[PDB]
Write a protein that binds this DNA or RNA. Structure first.
Ligand SMILES: [Mg+2]
Ligand SMILES: [Mg+2]
Ligand SMILES: [Mg+2]
Ligand SMILES: [Mg+2]
Ligand SMILES: [Mg+2]
Ligand SMILES: [Mg+2]
Ligand SMILES: [Mg+2]
Ligand SMILES: [Mg+2]
Ligand SMILES: [Mg+2]
Ligand SMILES: [Mg+2]
Lengths: 98, 127, 79, 114, 206, 96, 151
RNA sequence: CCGGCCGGGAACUCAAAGGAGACUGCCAGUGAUAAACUGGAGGAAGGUGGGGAUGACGUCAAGUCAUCAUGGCCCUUACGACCAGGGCUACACACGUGCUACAAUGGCGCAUACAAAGAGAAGCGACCUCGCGAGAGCAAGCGGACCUCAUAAAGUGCGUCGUAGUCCGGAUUGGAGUCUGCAACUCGACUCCAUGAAGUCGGAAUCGCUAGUAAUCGUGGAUCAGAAUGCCACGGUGAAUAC
C-alpha cells in the first residue's frame, strides 16, 4: 500500500536506514514486504590526469548509487507515526509515493 | 521431485531441470534444434550424456539467457552435469575427468585506458 | 543543402536593397552579411561582400539567386 | 541488345545489366524492370526483342547517357562561369565540398609529383 | 610526480569524505559549487581560527556545515555571536537554511592540515624552514603518531634554484590501505616565491 | 581565465532566458505547418547572445572551457583536486 | 620462455570426426575467429577429397599430409658476427603443425574459385606430392643438408 | 485472450548487502632432511586463479606561468574592452597515428537465433499517421530492474553472383533534399537519384599481441544545440605459437 524508495552513495549505511525503517514498522503496526536490494546504478567518470598533454594518463573514478525498496502493506495510522518522526539519515534519499 | 542443476558460463546462465522420461530436450520452450541444434555445438549440449546414458531415459526442460550461441550452450552443459547431482555422486567423477563439472571462469577482459582493447597496444614509431 | 522551410537573409541587407530598388541604385552596396541567400530582387545590383580585409563587388545576376553572398567573395588569398 | 545509349549490353541478369547505362544505378534499374513488368534475374536468352523495346521506352524517360554527360557538364560549367566558390574550385582542380587539402586531396588533385 | 593522493585512495576505507550529501545530477551541479562557496568564505573568515577541516551535508532542503577547529571559542565568539554572523551568511550563500557545528580538534599536532598551515604561517613570518619542519615532526612523535613526514618545495629560504627537502621520522606506509594516514597540503606565499607543504601523519592500522 | 571572457559567458546566460526560451518560443510554433505572412522568422533580430547555443560551458571555478563535466560543473583538473579530498560525494577512484 | 617453460593447451577433438589433429587444422585455416564457418570449408574440402579420392576421409588426409611433413629444419643462430643457419631434427608434434600450416597456406595462394575447392586441390596435389606445399618440404630439406656440415 | 498474463508461488534466474573458500596445505617426485619447483588429489577456483587500483629513493633545469596559483618582468586611452566579417578548415609537399578496401573465409537479396554495458526531464521519446528516405506531425510511458533510446552485428538458412577492376571497392562530383542552430558560402551531419578514382594484398623498413588474448563482429558514453574513422567503456564469435 505504501513503498519508500531509498538511495545513497554509501552502502554500509543505506541498509541502516533500511533496517531502521523496516524495524520501526514491524514493531509498530507492521507488515512490510521485506527490504529489496534493486540494481545499484554506478556512474563512471574517467578524465585526463595531467594539467597538459599525456592523454594516456587519466584517473578513472566512479559513483556507486544504491537502491532499497521497503514496501509496507498494512498502513497502520501508528506505523504512519512510525515512518514520520522516526527517521533522519542525512545522506539518504527517501521517496514515499511510487 | 524436480531434480535440478543450474550451471552458467561467460555472461550466459542456463537452468537445467531433470526428470526421468524420454530423450527429448526443451530449452527456452524450444527443440534442441529450433534454438541452436543445427549450429556450432549442438553435440555439446547432449555431450553431458556420454559415459552416463540416456538415448531416451531421462528428460530435461531448461532455459537460459545472456551471452551468446556457445556461452548458452556452455551454461546448459554445466547445468546438466550439475543436475546429474541427484543421480548420486558415483557418476560425478568421470564427469570431473570429462571436465564438464568445472565452471569455465574465462571472462571478457576490460578495455584499459592507454590501449586499444585490453591488450591491443597503439602501434608506435620512435620518430 | 539546408534551410528547407524558409530561405534566409539579414534584415539590414534586405532593407538595404529596397533603399536602392524604389530609390535607384547608388554606388556599390556594403554588407557583411555573407550568409544572406540572394534574391531575384537583387539582380542587377552590386553588393559589396566582406571577406576579411574588404568588400568585393559582385554584380548579382539571373542565376546567382539560390546561392549566398559569401560564395562570390573569396576569403583565403592563395597564389 | 542495344537500348537507349550507344551502349549494347546484356548477357547476364537484367537489373545488373541495365546499370551499364550512364544514368541508371540499381534503383533506376529495379524501377524499370518493374515499370515494364519483367523478371529481374533473367538473362536476354528467352528475352524477346518485343520485351527489349518496351524497356527501351522506359529508359527513354530519363536523361541517361550522352544527354546526361552534357547536362552534367553544363551544370559544372554554369558553376565556373558564376565565379563562385564551388566553381573557382572546379577550375583550380581541388575538392569542391570542403575536404582538407593540407593532405589527402589526391583523388581531386591527380597523383602527387614534385 | 607519481604518487597517488593518500587521502583519496583511502576514502572507501579508513578515511571519510568531507561531503556526505546525496543529490541527483540536476542539482549535483549547483550543490558542488555551493560547497566551494562555503569552504571559501569560511576559510577566509576563520583564517586565524586554526580551522583544520570543514565538512558539509545537506539533509533535505537544508545545509548543516560542520567545522573542525583547534580554537572553538574563537570560532564561536562571545556566547554564540560569531557562529551567527556565520550561519547567517552561510545559509545566505547556499540559499537553503543552515545550522553549523563546531567540532573540537584534539591534539592538532596530529592534524595534517593544521601542521602544514603552521609551517606555512611560519615561513611567511619568516623562519628557518629547516627548523620548522623539525619542530613539526617531533610534536607528533611526541603525542603518539607512529610516523610522520613533511617536505617543502622551492626557493626554500631564497635559493634562485628551487629545492624540496623532506623529513621522515618513524613509519609512513603510503601503500598499506588499512593504514590511517592523514595527508594534507599548504602553500606559503612568500616575498620571493610560493612554497608548498605536504605533511603525512601515520596513526595506525585497521 | 580572463574575467572579461567569464563576464561574456554570464551575460550570455542572462539574455539566454530573457528573450529566448521565453520570447523566442515564438518560432517553434511560429514555424510549423500553420500556413505565409513571412514576418514569421524575420524577428530574429534579438541580442545574438540571447541564444543558448551561444553559451560555452566553463569550469565553474576556473573558467577553463575544455575538459568540463556536466555532473560536477568543473574542469577535469579541479574535479580531481576536489575528488581526492572527498569533496565530491560518493566519488572515488574505481576499478573493476 | 626466458624461464617460464610451458606445456601446451589442448583443443576439442573436432565436432565431426573426433580428432584433435583436425581441430588444429580448422583453427589454422580459421580466420577472424569464425569457427562457425571454419570447419564448414574444411569438411566440404574433405568431402571433395572424400569421393574424388574414394580412399575415404581419415586416410586420405593422413597421406596427403604424410607428404608435406618435414623431418629436419634449419634454425637461425647469430654467433661470431655471422648468422649461421644451423640444422636440427624437428619434433613430431610440430612436424605436422607445419604440414598443416603449409597445406592451408598453399591453398589460399591458389586460383580455384572457392576455399573448399582450393584446399581440396592442395591436399590432392600433396597426395601425389606435387603441390606447392610439398615443394615447401623439398626446399626445407634442401636448405638444411646444405648446412649438412654444421651439426 | 496462450502474453508471467492472473491468482498465486518463494523454489530457481538475477538483483546487493553479509558470509565461508585456496594455505604449497594434502600425497608423491625433484632438490642439501631447507627454500622452492614439478606432477598428482580433491575442489568453482592450485601454486601470488583471472583482471584492476597501488608507481619507492631517485633520472631527464623532462612537460605545464594557457587549468589554477604564483616571485620577477612588461602594456594600461593599450599587451585591456566591446561589435561585425573572416581565420585556426589554406595546399608543390613530407612524416606520424588511425578508418575503408582490393573481394568468394566474399558481395547481395529475403528469412532468422543468441549479448553486455550505459543513457535519460531545456531529456529518452514510444504508438499512430505522413514521406522511398533522412526525417515529420500528432502523441503515451518514463527521473525510471517498470518507460524510452533499441530491430545487436558477426552467425545460420535458402537463393543469386562465378574470379571480371567484377553484382569487389567505394573516393570524387552533379542533382534534390532532411535536421540542428539568429546563422550550415567559407566549414555541419545525415538522406534519396545519378556518378563509380585509386585499389587485385603493398620496396627498403617497421609495429601489436602469450588466452577468452590476438583477430574479427556489432553496442553504449563523456564532450555535445549540431558536429566521432578519435577517445573511453561493452559483450558476441574465437585462434596460432614459445625449443
Ligand atoms: Mg572482445
Ligand atoms: Mg597519405
Ligand atoms: Mg585570471
Ligand atoms: Mg557549444
Ligand atoms: Mg617547452
Ligand atoms: Mg598572477
Ligand atoms: Mg584552434
Ligand atoms: Mg558494391
Ligand atoms: Mg584484405
Ligand atoms: Mg606479458
Amino acid at each position: 500500500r505504501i513503498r519508500i524508495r531509498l538511495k545513497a552513495f554509501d552502502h554500509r549505511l543505506i541498509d541502516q536506514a533500511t533496517a531502521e525503517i523496516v524495524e520501526t514498522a514491524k514493531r509498530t503496526g507492521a507488515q512490510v514486504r521485506g527490504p529489496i536490494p534493486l540494481p545499484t546504478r554506478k556512474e563512471r567518470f574517467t578524465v585526463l590526469i595531467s594539467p597538459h598533454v599525456n592523454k594516456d594518463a587519466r584517473d578513472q573514478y566512479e559513483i556507486r548509487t544504491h537502491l532499497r525498496l521497503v514496501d509496507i502493506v498494512e498502513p497502520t495510522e501508528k506505523t504512519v507515526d512510525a515512518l514520520m518522526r522516526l527517521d533522519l539519515a542525512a545522506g539518504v534519499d527517501v521517496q514515499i509515493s511510487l | 521431485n524436480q531434480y535440478y542443476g543450474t550451471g552458467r558460463r561467460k555472461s550466459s546462465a542456463a537452468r537445467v531441470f531433470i526428470k526421468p522420461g524420454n530423450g527429448k530436450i526443451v530449452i527456452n520452450q524450444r527443440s534442441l534444434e529450433q534454438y541452436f541444434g543445427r549450429e556450432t555445438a549442438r553435440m555439446v549440449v547432449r555431450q553431458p550424456l556420454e559415459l552416463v546414458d540416456m538415448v531416451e531415459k531421462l528428460d530435461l526442460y531448461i532455459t537460459v539467457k545472456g551471452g551468446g550461441i556457445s556461452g548458452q550452450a556452455g551454461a546448459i552443459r554445466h547445468g546438466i552435469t550439475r543436475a546429474l547431482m541427484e543421480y548420486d555422486e558415483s557418476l560425478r567423477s568421470e564427469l570431473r575427468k570429462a571436465g564438464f563439472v568445472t565452471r569455465d571462469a574465462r571472462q571478457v577482459e576490460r578495455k584499459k585506458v592507454g590501449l586499444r582493447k585490453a591488450r591491443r597496444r597503439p602501434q608506435f614509431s620512435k620518430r | 543543402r539546408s534551410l528547407k522551410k524558409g530561405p534566409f537573409i539579414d534584415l539590414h541587407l534586405l532593407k538595404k536593397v529596397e533603399k536602392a530598388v524604389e530609390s535607384g541604385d547608388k554606388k556599390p552596396l556594403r554588407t557583411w552579411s555573407r550568409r544572406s541567400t540572394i534574391f531575384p530582387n537583387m539582380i542587377g545590383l552590386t553588393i559589396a561582400v566582406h571577406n576579411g580585409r574588404q568588400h568585393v563587388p559582385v554584380f548579382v545576376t539571373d542565376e546567382m539567386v539560390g546561392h549566398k553572398l559569401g560564395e562570390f567573395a573569396p576569403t583565403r588569398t592563395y597564389r | 541488345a542495344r537500348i537507349a545509349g550507344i551502349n549494347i549490353p546484356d548477357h547476364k541478369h537484367a537489373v545488373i545489366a541495365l546499370t551499364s547505362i550512364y544514368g541508371v544505378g540499381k534503383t533506376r534499374s529495379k524501377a524499370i524492370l518493374a515499370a515494364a513488368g519483367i523478371a529481374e534475374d533473367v538473362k536476354i536468352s528467352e528475352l524477346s526483342e518485343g520485351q527489349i523495346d518496351t524497356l527501351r521506352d522506359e529508359v527513354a524517360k530519363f536523361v541517361v547517357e550522352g544527354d546526361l554527360r552534357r547536362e552534367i557538364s553544363m551544370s559544372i560549367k554554369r558553376l565556373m562561369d558564376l565565379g563562385c566558390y564551388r566553381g573557382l574550385r572546379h577550375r583550380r582542380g581541388l575538392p569542391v565540398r570542403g575536404q582538407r587539402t593540407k593532405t589527402n586531396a589526391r583523388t581531386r588533385k591527380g597523383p602527387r609529383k614534385p | 610526480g607519481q604518487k597517488v593522493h593518500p587521502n583519496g585512495i583511502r576514502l572507501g576505507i579508513v578515511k571519510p569524505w568531507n561531503s556526505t550529501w546525496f543529490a541527483n545530477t540536476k542539482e549535483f551541479a549547483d550543490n558542488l559549487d555551493s560547497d566551494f562557496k562555503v569552504r571559501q568564505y569560511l576559510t577566509k573568515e576563520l583564517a586565524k581560527a586554526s580551522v583544520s577541516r570543514i565538512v558539509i551535508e545537506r539533509p533535505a532542503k537544508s545545509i548543516r556545515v560542520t567545522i573542525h577547529t583547534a580554537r572553538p571559542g574563537i570560532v564561536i565568539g562571545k556566547k554564540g555571536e560569531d557562529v551567527e554572523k556565520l550561519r547567517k551568511v552561510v545559509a545566505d550563500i547556499a540559499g537553503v537554511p543552515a545550522q553549523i557545528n563546531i567540532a573540537e580538534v584534539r591534539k592538532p599536532e596530529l592534524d595534517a592540515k593544521l601542521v602544514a598551515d603552521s609551517i606555512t604561517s611560519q615561513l611567511e613570518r619568516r623562519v628557518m624552514f629547516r627548523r620548522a619542519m623539525k619542530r613539526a615532526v617531533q610534536n607528533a612523535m611526541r603525542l603518539g603518531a607512529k610516523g610522520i613526514k613533511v617536505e617543502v618545495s622551492g626557493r626554500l629560504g631564497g635559493a634562485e634554484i628551487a629545492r624540496t627537502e623532506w623529513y621522515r621520522e618513524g613509519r609512513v606506509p603510503l601503500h598499506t590501505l588499512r593504514a590511517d594516514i592523514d595527508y594534507n597540503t599548504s602553500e606559503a606565499h612568500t616575498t620571493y616565491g610560493v612554497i608548498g607543504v605536504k605533511v603525512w601523519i601515520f596513526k595506525g592500522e585497521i | 581565465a580572463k574575467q572579461s571572457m567569464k563576464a561574456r559567458e554570464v551575460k550570455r546566460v542572462a539574455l539566454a532566458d530573457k528573450y529566448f526560451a521565453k520570447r523566442a518560443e515564438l518560432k517553434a510554433i511560429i514555424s510549423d505547418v500553420n500556413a505565409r505572412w513571412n514576418a514569421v522568422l524575420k524577428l530574429q533580430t534579438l541580442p545574438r547572445d540571447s541564444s543558448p547555443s551561444r553559451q560555452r560551458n566553463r569550469c565553474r571555478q576556473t573558467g577553463r572551457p575544455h575538459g568540463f563535466l556536466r555532473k560536477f560543473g568543473l574542469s577535469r583538473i579541479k574535479v580531481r583536486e576536489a575528488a581526492m579530498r572527498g569533496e565530491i560525494p560518493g566519488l572515488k577512484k574505481a576499478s573493476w | 620462455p626466458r624461464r617460464r617453460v610451458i606445456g601446451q593447451r589442448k583443443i576439442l577433438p573436432d565436432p565431426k570426426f573426433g580428432s584433435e589433429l583436425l581441430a588444429k587444422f580448422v583453427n589454422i585455416l580459421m580466420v577472424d575467429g569464425k569457427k562457425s564457418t571454419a570447419e564448414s570449408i574444411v569438411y566440404s574440402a574433405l568431402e571433395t577429397l572424400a569421393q574424388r579420392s574414394g580412399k575415404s576421409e581419415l586416410e586420405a588426409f593422413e597421406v596427403a599430409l604424410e607428404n608435406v611433413r618435414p623431418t629436419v629444419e634449419v634454425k637461425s643462430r647469430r654467433v661470431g658476427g655471422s648468422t649461421y643457419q644451423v640444422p636440427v631434427e624437428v619434433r613430431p608434434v610440430r612436424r605436422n603443425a607445419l604440414a598443416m600450416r603449409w597445406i592451408v597456406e598453399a591453398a589460399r595462394k591458389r586460383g580455384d574459385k572457392s576455399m573448399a575447392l582450393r584446399l581440396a586441390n592442395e591436399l590432392s596435389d600433396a597426395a601425389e606430392n606435387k603441390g606447392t606445399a610439398v615443394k615447401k618440404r623439398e626446399d626445407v630439406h634442401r636448405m638444411a643438408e646444405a648446412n649438412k656440415a654444421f651439426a
